[model samples]
Target: VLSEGEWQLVLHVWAKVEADVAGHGQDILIRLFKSHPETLEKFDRFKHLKTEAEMKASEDLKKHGVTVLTALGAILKKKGHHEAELKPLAQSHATKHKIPIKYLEFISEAIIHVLHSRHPGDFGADAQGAMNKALELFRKDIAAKYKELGYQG
Candidate 1:
């Protein structure tokens, strides 16, 4: 299990990625890959595809990383949010990759690991709490996105 600090790092990275992708495009994925090479392993498709479309699709999945965080944050914000979002996000990834639902958790954990490694000392209780708050707001904003996509959990 992850420590509170570790979990905070996870949320902080996730929240930051979501906000960045919301404002900017998925350029963050390249930056993240450079910073944390291990995250690439989570996506089997990354191993085979060498074309631009494949690359864009890979980055597009990271864009949905924000959706996962938003869903988690919604859960923390209000009860039943997980029920609304987690399953659908997991299912979407499963369908895309033809992998098991458990990979979603692995992807999330890998993202947290990457963030903590990148910013070793920057994450702590304050960052965690802030992410918690931001995640709630993100969830409220993106709740419809989850529903429209037919996700549950």
Candidate 2:
């Protein structure tokens, strides 16, 4: 039910996550420029040029965090043992991200906002379940990627 522009915003958020997790943010930006050359005019050099190994490392953590969040969201949607199932995953994500448990609440809220904005009328319980599944898949992929990178977590 959301307008196309809103959906695109949601996609943009997902794209950001994808770029971070894949360790290809620069590559994605390059491709984006290639496809939409005009966007280059509006790009801010300070933001666009900011790149560092630390930022890239943070991406790995963000990726894992997204995964755990998604799984928790799904369980909640299913009306299952939501808190019990989510607690461990949240802990794992927090440990990996070096963030506090309270941050998970913020992260979940942001995700819900994105989902609701993108699918205005579809903000039902099952929609949450679907989003959770999506998060789960993202988590699994990030975990594998981190393992490949020799991450202890």
Candidate 3:
């Protein structure tokens, strides 16, 4: 969905995060949990972490963060087709995890926040807009799978 200049800017910003996926990923998750504490209940591994320090120390959190970031990497790989990468995640979240679709929205916004916070100079308003568009494309693709999987929300 990103135009030429938009895609270029996104990649430029993405490359910085991709350089240290685990570090950046955990920051994103930490930011999400800090703002949306209720979402912490969705993760069995992290739900037990009562404090932000506990969450930061938990290897489980890091692993899950890596999983999230890796999924994001796959979603950003191909230009025209994200379904292959998105479908399995949608299905798993729907059936296995029973995660609400809104959590995806939360995560997407958290990603935007993390990107902007990490690279204030690189990810300005225009780059944030482009990243939002990219993540929206990801959201819509996953939503279709959730629909097919009979998820009401």
Candidate 4:
């Protein structure tokens, strides 16, 4: 759903994070856990961790961050092909993690927060608007798959 300029905005934002996927991605997850305390329970790997710093040090966090970033890379590969990449993730989140849709929904805003915090100069209001649009597209694509897989949520 990104226009020409919107695509450029996100691509530029993504390049920086993708360059250090593990770190940036973990920051995103950490932000999520901070923003929504209960979301930590969704990740069995980190639920036992007592502190954010400890969670950051965990290997599972690194691997999960990388995996998420890779999925994001696939979504960024080409706008139109996101469904192929997102469908399975939707199904897995719904079934495997039993993750409620709202936590998944919270990811977009959390992503916006992480990117802006890292580079406020780059992700200004205009760029943040574009980022929200891109996330809406991603959310829509993935949410549909929940229904596709017969998930009522």
Best by TM-score: 3
lDDT of 1 by residue, 1-153 (tens): 234553445455545554553322334344345454544665554645434355556655666555544555564434333455454544455456443322333333444444554545665656554543443333333444444544423
Per-residue CA lDDT of candidate 2, range 16-49, in tens? 3443423333333333334434333434332343
- List the candidate numbers ranked by TM-score, top first: 3, 4, 1, 2
Clashing pairs in 2: 67-139
What is each predicted model's overall lDDT from 0 to 1? 0.46, 0.41, 0.76, 0.75
Between candidates 1 and 3, which one is better according to TM-score?
A: 3
**TM-score, cand. 4 vs. native:** 0.90
TM-score of 1: 0.40
The residue pairs in collision within model 1 are 83-153, 87-152, 88-151, 88-152
The alpha-carbon lDDT assigned to residue 2 of candidate 1 equals 32
lDDT tens readout by residue for model 3, 5-95: 7776666677777887877787888667788887788876657777767656778668777788788777776544666787788777888
Of 1 and 3, the candidate ahead on lDDT is 3
TM-score on alpha carbons, each prediction: 0.40, 0.33, 0.92, 0.90
- Of the two candidates 1 and 4, the one with more favorable TM-score, higher being better, is 4
- Tell how far residue 141 is off in model 1, in angstroms: 22
lDDT minimum window of 10 residues, candidate 3: 74-83
